Amino acid sequence: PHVGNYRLLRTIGKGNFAKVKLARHILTGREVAIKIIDKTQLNPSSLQKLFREVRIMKGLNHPNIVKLFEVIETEKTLYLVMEYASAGEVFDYLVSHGRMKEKEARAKFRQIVSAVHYCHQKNIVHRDLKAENLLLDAEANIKIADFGFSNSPPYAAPELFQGKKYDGPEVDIWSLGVILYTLVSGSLPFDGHNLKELRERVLRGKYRVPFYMSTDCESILRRFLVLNPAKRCTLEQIMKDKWINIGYEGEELKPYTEPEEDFGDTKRIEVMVGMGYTREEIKESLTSQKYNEVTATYLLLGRK
Numbered sequence: 001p002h003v004g005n006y007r008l009l010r011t012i013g014k015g016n017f018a019k020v021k022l023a024r025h026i027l028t029g030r031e032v033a034i035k036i037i038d039k040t041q042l043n044p045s046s047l048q049k050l051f052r053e054v055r056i057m058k059g060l061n062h063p064n065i066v067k068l069f070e071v072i073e074t075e076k077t078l079y080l081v082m083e084y085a086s087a088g089e090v091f092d093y094l095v096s097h098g099r100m101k102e103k104e105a106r107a108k109f110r111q112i113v114s115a116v117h118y119c120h121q122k123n124i125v126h127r128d129l130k131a132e133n134l135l136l137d138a139e140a141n142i143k144i145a146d147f148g149f150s151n152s153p154p155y156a157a158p159e160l161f162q163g164k165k166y167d168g169p170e171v172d173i174w175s176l177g178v179i180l181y182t183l184v185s186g187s188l189p190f191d192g193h194n195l196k197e198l199r200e201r202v203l204r205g206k207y208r209v210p211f212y213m214s215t216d217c218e219s220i221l222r223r224f225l226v227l228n229p230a231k232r233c234t235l236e237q238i239m240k241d242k243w244i245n246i247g248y249e250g251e252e253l254k255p256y257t258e259p260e261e262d263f264g265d266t267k268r269i270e271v272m273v274g275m276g277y278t279r280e281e282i283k284e285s286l287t288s289q290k291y292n293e294v295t296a297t298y299l300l301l302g303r304k
């Protein structure tokens with residue numbers, strides 16, 4: 001019930017290799033989520049994917065992507081201390097509260113587009129965008145989680161169902177069209193019992209659209225759910241769309257740029273010394289994006 005500066009609370013996730021636990025940072029009192037991985041139970045390729053995952057995580061800084069704080073290493077187990085998305089899956093939110101009204105789907109979807117574009121810019125392709133990997137904080141903001149399979153069938157592009165060419169950003173774009181479709185309707189655009197039916201409908205690319213849907217919504221989905229990855233619209237282009245910006249007259253959705261982070265908050269620096277941190281230790285490990293006990297404590301003292 002303790003690893004590093006963390007008290008392990010309850011398991012909040014379980015995969016076929018990893019488990020996520022809610023934890024409390026004993027110094028700052030902040031809640032975090034730790035993705036626990038037993039490296040001994042992993043085959044050589046998933047071990048390679050876990051190392052890719054940790055690298056990708058290190059190179060991302062967006063307010064709508066679950067952020068890494070600390071990496072606790074042991075011979076047999078890897079500990080990935082990240083943000084805790086308090087309100088859970090969007091999937092659950094939809095079953096619990098019904099389809100989202102377009103103002104709500106727009107608020108959430110703009111964030112997803114900002115976050116997914118940022119990844120493509122920093123040469124990352126999520127490859128697992130599902131409503132499961134989409135979560136919320138207490139202020140109901142999207143936080144894209146996982147990155148295990150980066151560089152599900154109902155969200156998978158037609159080319160991947162065939163076993164065709166790679167490319168990348170385009171496969172995440174088809175998924176975003178599947179996400180928006182669920183956000184506004186509650187259901188998935190393409191389904192069907194056994195895998196053969198789902199494969200057929202994704203490939204035919206035919207989806208019903210509900211009477212309540214706005215004409216601008218039905219249009220914006222056609223830009224994403226393009227059966228041809230080449231003719232599929234780009235995120236820089238879709239960000240300019242009528243729908244994405246309804247009720248955002250001044251602020252049209254433009255690509256995210258990571259701002260200048262202040263690694264010199266005099267108030268958080270002194271408050272750390274009163275715990276056991278030294279001037280030389282803080283300065284040396286803050287200036288450098290190390291992700292250690294020090295870095296984590298400083299980022300957590302401005303979170304609450």
Ligand SMILES: CCc1sc(C(=O)N[C@@H]2[C@H](N)CCCC2(F)F)cc1-c1cnn2cc(C(F)(F)F)cnc12
Nearest residue numbers: 012013014015033034035082084085088089145146
């Ligand atoms: C450490 C931060 C991570 S890594 C990550 C993750 O990789 N999950 C995968 C997989 N998609 C599901 C099975 C376990 C798995 F294999 F690990 C998810 C989270 C996370 C952050 N806040 N939070 C809140 C909840 C919830 F809903 F509130 F319970 C659930 N998960 C989280």
